[PDB]
């Protein structure tokens, strides 16, 4: 439950408006 | 004698930025070779920023000041792919400068609480002339504001005050679960980042609760986990600048309705820090080291981190 919570919440970091290498 | 630092906290809170800062301060910083590499990224982020603002005027239904410039918008989406290789066409620069100066677009930007606008947007859009030069090489600061999509686990290491620091950003890496879990193993200190300026954000279609309260629940989970009873908890209340500006206009009652205090930056910040620190349910057995950061301010981060290190050393002398 803890790790799932972490992955869920930490991932919303706006994937549009971002780029890769 | 080795020190394992783990960055946690929700998305867009400053983690990757803090890592970059760690590079700039305790590593040699970024070499001109790499700065060159980040040019395309800069142009890109600038583009997606202005685009995002435009789509936002779409959904919020806000018309331009001068309806003329609208054509550039239509043109922008076509000229959008003009960065990938290199050099933003002076034609494109004129599209951006025209759209960003438009008081109708600005009216959408000043309502960025109602949608999802990047926090690095302004930094780029205001400094457009400097970067739209063809001979442009990015400032270290320009690289700080770069937003890179994360593959998996981010990690930097450095030597400081006769100590070896290994620092991890485990965020979002749904794969490599063993290396991912090992980031949570034997942690000397967790650095939880909180974006203060997220207090006035509007409840979105996909959230159960307010964004700040999401971060709070997450902190409740982390702080009171039996595994971390012997781990120092460091709380970075970040984006203090944007919070100070926002708090002038947007009341904290937006986010904490029960808040009866005043709208001074100092009193409000204290109230938030209280709200988070109250979540420590092992209050006697564990103390929380709270700091108020502006992760884009290298000087500030350097200071705060120095202080953190000092606390660590003082905890070592205890041993
Ligand atoms: N103005 C300002 N922007 C910040 C501050 N801290 C973080 N940001 C912005 O937040 C954006 C994303 O932060 P990021 O490091 O990616 O957070 P992460 O997703 O948790 O790793 C960046 O564009 C930063 O410019 C701050 O103190 N002031």
Cβ–Cβ pairs < 8 A, chains A and B:
69
Residue after which a domain boundary falls, among B99, B114, B149:
B149
C-alpha to C-alpha distance for B217 and B280, rounded to whole angstroms: 11
B169 is catalytic: yes
Element holding A10 (H helix, E strand): helix A2-10
Active site residue B106: no
Find tokens 């991932």 and name the residue: A11
Of B149, B177, B200, which marks where a domain is finished? Answer: B149
Question: How wide is the angle at C-alpha B192 spanned by C-alphas B186 and B197, nearest 5°?
Answer: 170
Q: Which residues contact B25 (CB under 8 A, 6 or more apart)?
A: B298, B301, B302, B305
Cβ atoms of residues B234 and B291 within 8 Å: yes
The whole-angstrom separation of Cα B292 and Cα B67 is 43
Residues of B in contact with A12 (CB under 8 A): 10-12
CA distance to partner chain A, nearest, from residue B198 (Å): 13
Question: Do B6 and B183 contact (CB within 8 A), yes or no?
Answer: yes
Residue whose C-alpha is closest to residue B165's, from B21, B35, B30, B290: B21
Identify whether residues B182 and B88 lie together within a single domain: no
What single DSSP character describes residue A11?
T
The SS3 call for residue A16 is: coil
B144 & B40 share domain = yes
Same domain, B199 and B315: yes
Burial, B257: exposed, middle or buried (Cβ in 10 Å; 0-12, 13-18, 19+)?
exposed
* H/E run at residue A15: none
> Quick one: tokens of B77?
């989406």
Q: For residue B270, what is the domain's CATH number? A: 3.40.50.300
Q: Give the burial class of B83: count Cβ atoms within 10 A of its Cβ; 0-12 exposed, 13-18 middle, 19 or more buried.
A: buried
CA-wise closest residue to B269 among B190, B173, B199, B167: B199
Question: DSSP code of A12?
Answer: -
CB count within 10 Å of CB B135 equals 4
User: Residues B137, B275: one domain?
Assistant: no
Strand partners, B163: B160
CA distance A5 to chain B (A): 7
Task: Give which of B204, B186, B223, B270 is closest to B3, Cα–Cα.
Answer: B186
Resolution of the PDB structure in angstroms: 3.5
Subunit contact B118:A14, Cβ cutoff 8 A: yes
What's the distance, CA B57 to chain centroid?
24
Residues in chain A: 21
Helix (H) / strand (E) containing A4: helix A2-10
- Whether the CB-CB separation of B121 and B113 falls below 8 Å is answered with no
Chain A nearest C-alpha distance from B260 (Å): 29
Q: Is A7 helix (H, G, I), strand (E, B) or coil?
A: helix
* Furthest C-alpha separation in chain A: 32
The domain boundary, picked from B119, B149, B179, lies at B149
One domain for residues B106 and B206? no
Q: With contacts defined as CB-CB under 8 Å, which chain B residues touch A20? A: 148-149, 151
User: Could you tell me if B2 and B53 lie in one domain?
Assistant: no
Question: Across the interface, do A14 and B214 touch by the CB < 8 Å criterion?
Answer: no
Active site residue B214: no
| DSSP string of chain B, one letter each residue | -EEEEEEE--TTSSHHHHHHHHHHHHS----HHHHHHTHHHHHHHHHHHHHHHHHHHHHHT---SSGGGHHHHHHHHHHTTSSSSS---HHHHHHHHHHHH-HHHHHHHTTTTTTT--TTHHHHHHTHHHHHSTT----HHHHHT--B---S-EEEEEEETTEEEEEEE-TT--S-HHHHHHTTSS-SEEEEEEEGGGGGPPPPTT-SS-HHHHHHHHHHHHHT-GGGTTSEEEEEEE-HHHHHHHHHHS-GGGT-TT--S---HHHHHHHHHHHHHTT-S-TTT--EEEEE--TT-HHHHHHHHHHHHHHHHHHHHT-
Number of Cβ atoms within 10 Å of the Cβ of B318 = 6
Does B16 count as an annotated binding residue? yes
**Experimental method for this entry?**
X-ray
Query: Do B316 and B168 fall within a single domain?
Result: yes
Please enumerate, as own/partner, the contacts of B90-93 that have beta carbons within 8 Å and a separation of 24 or more: B90/B132, B93/B128, B93/B132
> Structurally, how many domains does chain B consist of?
2
B42, B136: one domain:
yes
| Residue B120 marked as a ligand binder | yes
Q: What is the CATH number of the domain that holds B87?
A: 1.10.400.10
Residue B270 makes CB contacts below 8 A (sequence gap 6+) with: none
CA distance B298 to B166: 19
Are B71 and B23 within one domain?
A: no
Q: Which of B37, B172, B179 to mutate to test the interface with A (most CBs of A within 10 A)?
A: B172
B151 is an active site residue: no
The one-character DSSP state at A19 is B
Give chain B's largest Cα–Cα span: 70
Same structural domain, B3 and B66 = no
Contacts of B233 (CB under 8 A, 6+ apart): B189, B190, B192, B222, B223, B280, B286, B288, B289
Q: B154 has which bridge partners?
A: B169
Among candidate residues B48, B75, B139, B173, the one labeled active-site is B173
Location of structure tokens 């600005």: B106
- Per-residue b/e over B177-212, b at no fewer than 16 CB within 10 Å? eeebeebbeebbbbbbbbbbbbbbbeeeeeeeebbb
Its domain, for residue B99, covers 31-149
Give the distance (Å) from ligand 1 centre to CA of residue B78. Answer: 29
A8 is in an annotated binding site: no
Statement to judge: residues B39 and B126 lie in one domain: yes
State whether B24 and B37 are in the same domain: no
């Amino acid at each position: 439950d803890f790790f799932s919570l972490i992955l869920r919440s930490q991932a919303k970091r706006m994937d549009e408006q971002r780029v890769l290498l | 004698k080795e020190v394992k630092l783990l960055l946690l906290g929700a998305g867009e809170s400053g983690k990757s930025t803090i890592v970059k800062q760690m590079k700039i301060i305790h590593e040699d910083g970024y070499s001109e070779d790499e700065c060159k590499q980040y040019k395309v990224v800069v142009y890109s982020n600038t583009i997606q920023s202005i685009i995002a603002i435009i789509r936002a005027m779409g959904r919020l239904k806000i018309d331009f000041g001068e309806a003329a410039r609208a054509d550039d918008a239509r043109q922008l989406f076509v000229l959008a792919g003009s960065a990938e290789e290199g050099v933003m066409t002076p034609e494109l620069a004129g599209v951006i400068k025209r759209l960003w100066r438009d008081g109708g677009v600005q009216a959408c930007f000043s309502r960025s609480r109602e949608y999802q606008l990047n926090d690095s947007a302004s930094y780029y859009l205001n400094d457009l002339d400097r970067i739209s030069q063809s001979n442009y090489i990015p400032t270290q600061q320009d690289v700080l504001r770069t937003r890179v999509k994360t593959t998996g686990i981010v990690e930097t290491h450095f030597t400081f005050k006769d100590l070896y620091f290994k620092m991890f950003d485990v965020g979002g890496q749904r794969s490599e679960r063993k290396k991912w879990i090992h980031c949570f193993e034997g942690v000397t200190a967790i650095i939880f980042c909180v974006a203060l300026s997220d207090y006035d954000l509007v409840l979105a279609e996909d959230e159960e609760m307010n964004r700040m309260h999401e971060s709070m629940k997450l902190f409740d989970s982390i702080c009171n986990n039996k595994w971390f009873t012997e781990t120092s908890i460091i709380l970075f209340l970040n984006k203090k600048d944007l919070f100070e500006e926002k708090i002038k206009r947007s009341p904290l009652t937006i986010c904490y309705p029960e808040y009866t205090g005043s709208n001074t930056y100092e009193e409000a910040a204290a109230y938030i820090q209280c709200q988070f620190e109250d979540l420590n349910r092992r209050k006697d057995t564990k103390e929380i080291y709270t700091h108020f950061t502006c992760a884009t301010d290298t000087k500030n981060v350097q200071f705060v981190f120095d202080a953190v290190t000092d606390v660590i050393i003082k905890n070592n002398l205890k041993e």
